[PDB]
Assembly symmetry: D2
Homo-oligomer: 266 residues x 4
């Protein structure tokens, strides 16, 4: 006779968990996550901002890289998120406990974060992580300012209801660089049509392709670097092959249309 199955851990490709030293993107913006998971540190004269943290076990590595950059735990002021899945919001609860950081997120991301990713619209309880509370709720197009760097929220619902693109302007060589950190536009194993948990899913993805296409976007970054053709291990040429926001959105829409056709067939 047969016992219920053991709980299964959320396991990922090794490269997603491979630590890297900080990689500079612009004068105040650094990649400090792993080879294949983005975690952006933005350093200001008035404290630091983190956009995404990657997987739950990455907290101490993030703190090490912040230290290397001159950011102590007390200096971390704000955490922002692309979306509240385990491989991007994983270490947020632990980072809040170990630093001065407060979380800003939209309502959808906040409720998923507070559930630790449980009762996911598509994954159920298969991919969970330590829950955390949001300190500030943001609305579409709202700005947050830290040390004079202005971050704007652009909602792009689909991958999760709370999926967000974050944009800000940094500098490089004395010239402004408009950075767009755009969320995933994938739908991995999702039921797209007639989904009772997400009835307007397709309409939301279509709007989000348009949103991403139109972002202020000298440089595009994504939570998985491969999605925007970044190679974090490629040093001085890490961002050389990066997609524009237009090309990223077009690729995502073409992929999405193909998935829809397959779902209709399958």
């Amino acid at each position: 006779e047969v016992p219920l199955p053991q709980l299964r851990a959320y396991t990922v490709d090794a490269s997603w968990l491979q630590p890297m030293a900080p990689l500079q993107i612009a004068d105040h913006t650094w990649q400090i996550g792993t080879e294949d998971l983005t975690a952006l540190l933005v350093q200001t004269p008035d404290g630091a901002v983190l956009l995404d943290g990657g997987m739950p076990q990455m907290a101490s590595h993030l703190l090490d890289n912040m230290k290397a950059r001159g950011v102590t735990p007390r200096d971390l002021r704000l955490i922002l998120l692309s979306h509240a899945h385990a491989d991007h919001a994983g270490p947020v609860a632990e980072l809040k406990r170990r630093t001065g950081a407060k979380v800003a997120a939209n309502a959808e991301s906040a409720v998923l974060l507070a559930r630790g990713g449980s009762d996911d619209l598509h994954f159920g309880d298969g991919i969970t992580y330590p829950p955390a509370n949001a300190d500030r709720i943001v609305m579409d197009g709202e700005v947050i300012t830290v040390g004079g760097i202005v971050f704007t929220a652009h909602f792009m619902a689909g991958h999760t209801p709370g999926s967000t693109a974050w944009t800000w302007t940094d500098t490089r060589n004395g010239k402004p660089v408009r950075i767009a950190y755009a969320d995933s536009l994938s739908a991995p194993g999702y039921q797209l049509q007639g989904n009772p948990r997400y009835p307007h899913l397709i309409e939301d993805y279509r709007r989000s392709f348009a949103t991403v296409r139109a972002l202020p976007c000298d440089v595009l970054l994504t939570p998985h670097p491969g999605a925007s053709n970044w190679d974090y291990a490629a040093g001085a040429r890490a961002g050389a092959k990066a997609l524009t926001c237009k090309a990223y959105a077009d690729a995502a829409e073409q992929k999405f249309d193909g998935q829809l056709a397959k779902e209709t067939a399958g």
Copy 2:
């Protein structure tokens, strides 16, 4: 070079996950969990109560056994807990979504439940589960009444700060049976002395031994049946060898004293 380790799932002995048919304890009280995890159903003319649910993957099995007993999802009114660890409160969030059930717990258990067992005083984030909210907060000695069965809370802090014994009076052969569902009194791998996260840990365990010793207790049940010498697979003799509350408390205190001595040596 070396990636961060993969997340590790909370895995348990097979017998902890082995489904069993309902085993009657008294006229209205049934064991409906697994061979080695207690989940008690108390059926009243005015709805049902569940005390503990076991592991997260046990939700559907619990619902099956309730159905077998004549309890539909709408009939489940109340969930009570021994303590909010993954192997006793595991399926609570899912049960709340799939039934009419509301959760009553003390403040300590409620905050741990809402974190999904994360940031545990002793386990860190090693043993987590889907978070759930409590609908009612109870105080020490408070009663809750369902269909005329009266449940009394007896706080017994130690194993967790929110550890609770639940007592009620059922019947068997026309005579009252005072049932005591006493929580774990173990301290598995805990730092007992000078623990910065739990400075009065030893004082709390000592008080809890006294509390358990004095419970109204014709029949003792525990979240792990082995702790009270129950054998759920032994049919008509399942409870024959069960400890008294006095003997359970004495055994736990002797074990605890030995662990203290070993900690001092080790």
Copy 3:
């Protein structure tokens, strides 16, 4: 010298607090709130649903009217909300404590409900109420079924980010009646243009006028009955003068356009 001002209570017109006996709308749908605040009871063979509860002090009155209708506290299964302001969600926390009811709401309404209406985008902390937790989060167009009555959520953001219309089909004289419970479309004292807390406010109101115009709508009801020209004190002619959803939306848009023009001038 001068002390800080005393806290000021949220006071309302007397008619908003004037109890009324249940007024039947269709075969299973009743108005059970006050003369000028809507609270709809929908009775099914499988339990009851409440849509809105009015002000915080209305809980006991609601329970009295439910009792008069044959609905005991245990029979109330579900609370739905138009929006989470004090004069519609006021008694929700108390109703959850005193009944079997669980709350279903969208993410925006859930986070405002959990704050008890504090940190409102427009009112600050001026209009607060006892906080409550949502048991189920719903997405736009999602359905909830109770005793065979099907409720559909239609998001209509503006008055609050989480403003929702609820629609369902009841019967009257053997014929179907498509009921639309549409939220407020007012913006009382709001900064409409360039609002940093709600940057897309005007775009959201415009979309919501279109949403309301298109609802399945044999009979329109609104949280303030006057907004849809209901007169709950008018007995057999209570709903005689009621607006269509089209006329309600058109009136709201004309009002809104006038407010925009005044804001530009003022």
Copy 4:
């Protein structure tokens, strides 16, 4: 015919709302609240701590006094609480939004804080305030360290289940000063005996008198200064008549015994 009563605001004596300039207690410790509500600022080389905030409308005044002391919003690191009633935790939610501050509290205080003081064991929904979340849960006897000042929690349940005394050592004239910020020991209008919401109320108060009597206590402060015979308007003699912790506890117990006798008679 008669409408339901209007909501009634929580109004207090004018002196409770009378702003005062900062009054120094020891080298790093200041009273910065009102004439009759304590709010203690402790300034360290590594950020500031606030113990209590008074009433909800005191947030801006607190921020003004912090500014006068050289503490900017970003410098406020930690809020601690005596108990989570409206006249001590009132402005906590707003302070968290406007500063860098995180809240540390025990489980009981955290759950009451998250409800905004609603569903109080004794007051019901009569005295509510904006809800806030705790960032850190503390256990009895646990320490928190900021800039080298060590704060110790001493639970003293009774006035609320989560009532806490906070102790720390400051300096004055080159000598250590052991400061005890002891919570209220009052029971205003409480049912003491046989209270179904608080069955061990009397036992908890008795233990708390003993706890307070034994605190390290060169200087006693209380949330209402009058309770410890402080006069914040008396300048250089503000603390001259202050009670010892022993005398404060003895007075509270004598008062409590009298209230018990009256309850038995009345």
